[PDB]
Chains A and B, each alone.
Chain A
């Protein structure tokens, strides 16, 4: 039968494509508008795909954010990503939203993080959280003391205290702390070790995934 032979060749093609496509990482770079995600893209129109090999590991990155539609209808397509590369610019704490111009960017970003972290599709998905443009954030925090953005701060305007407070706020609102790991990293515009942090973080993610698959955890 020629049709049976064609179907067997097609099935061989499909299983080879699966064997060469189950070894990829499939990162979901879901950041926020003007939050320095493009910088992460350069150091590596509804979905933008970036493919790069680091240390003989293949990474596929879904630069989502240009959709501008209701997120409840298309986010479940990304169920099964290794991690969510949530990108926030620290220096944008005092920056104003372009859409609304009356409500702060950190409040919008933590609202987005509360929405993304607390959903059915990412119950067991780690969030690699990059904090972009810290090399502008030290000057902005010497000028603006973060008091207007966070009334509940009760602290000084030092770089370390403000950065740790923002990292604590981002690791806050993770209601399901047992399964989701907020791998937080501090990066500049000129930082070049972001791909190394991504490699190490997804190595920890796949090790924890193998622990749960083997039942050791």
Chain B
């Protein structure tokens, strides 16, 4: 269908421009800061999302079978969990650190240093790994039918399955979503009050939150529906429908390079300096 063209465009942009961001933020060209360190971490997470998710989730839907093996399935499941958790927690980290940089700027002058940026980045990566240990512990590949492999997430008790599902839902979508929403609302409010074209980038601060919910809501809602409903949840969301839902999520990995980095002129100047 049309899914393959959109997956190809999103892969092309979200690998090309994202690796360009990783290259530019790699060598310090006087435009690397605390928030640029957080953008480097988010770019690594989104590149891992782009290279680990979309060809490896499209094919179980586009071909209907999992060509790869069980150890590949578990490693890609670890990549799934670590990349989604690091991407959401890194977005929240950029939100909270902008909330410290513009609201209460003296505390930013006190403790907003690159050492703190590295400490927070390492903390989110380690927490993501620890929380998503059960993701390759329990992604046992089961032959579904005669000769079809699907990488089912078998859990020992159902109660554990929906308990972990709601744990993921609150700890990666609900609480991170409300934290980033509150943080950028406070940034917009103190932009209006504390200090005009900044009122015009309040539009960008709005899209960073409402578009984030728009991109990331169907994935978590579908997975929660899978967790409780069980039998029959797959039949409504198999094929192209779910293969578009994840595309919205990967559109998130498509829009993160465009908004923080590519929109502003400073990164264009960094691009010119790199050349």
- Answer whether residue B9 sits at the interface, using C-beta atoms and an 8 A cutoff: no
Report, as a range, how many residues of chain A touch the other chain: 10 to 19
- Answer whether residue B27 sits at the interface, using C-beta atoms and an 8 A cutoff: no
- Answer whether residue A204 sits at the interface, using C-beta atoms and an 8 A cutoff: yes
The digit string for B188-207, where 1 denotes a CB below 8 A from any CB of A, is: 00010011011001000100
In Å, the complex CA distance between A101 and B195 comes to 43
- Answer whether residue B41 sits at the interface, using C-beta atoms and an 8 A cutoff: no
Chain A residues lying within 8 Å of B113, measured Cβ to Cβ, are 19, 22
- Answer whether residue A211 sits at the interface, using C-beta atoms and an 8 A cutoff: yes
Are A57 and B106 in contact (CB-based, < 8 A)? yes
- Answer whether residue A74 sits at the interface, using C-beta atoms and an 8 A cutoff: no
- A22 to B: closest C-beta gap in Å: 7
In Å, the complex CA distance between A55 and B34 comes to 25
- Answer whether residue B264 sits at the interface, using C-beta atoms and an 8 A cutoff: yes
Chain A residues lying within 8 Å of B187, measured Cβ to Cβ, are 216
- Answer whether residue A203 sits at the interface, using C-beta atoms and an 8 A cutoff: yes
Query: Would you call the interface of chain B mostly helix, strand, loop, or mixed?
Result: helix
Give the number of residues in B that approach A within 8 Å (Cβ atoms): 26
Chain A residues lying within 8 Å of B33, measured Cβ to Cβ, are 213-214
Are A215 and B105 in contact (CB-based, < 8 A)? no
Chain B residues lying within 8 Å of A214, measured Cβ to Cβ, are 33, 35, 98, 101-102
- Among A204, A206, A207, A217, which residue has the most Cβ atoms of chain B within 10 A? A207
- Answer whether residue B119 sits at the interface, using C-beta atoms and an 8 A cutoff: no
In Å, the complex CA distance between A216 and B202 comes to 9
In Å, the complex CA distance between A71 and B33 comes to 31
Chain A residues lying within 8 Å of B98, measured Cβ to Cβ, are 214, 216
Chain A residues lying within 8 Å of B159, measured Cβ to Cβ, are none
- B195 to A: closest C-beta gap in Å: 7
Q: Which residue of B lies closest to A207 (CB)?
A: B105
The digit string for B149-186, where 1 denotes a CB below 8 A from any CB of A, is: 00000000000000000000000000000000000000
In the A-B complex, list the 4 residue pairs whose CB atoms are closest, starting with the nearest. A210-B101, A215-B264, A214-B35, A213-B33
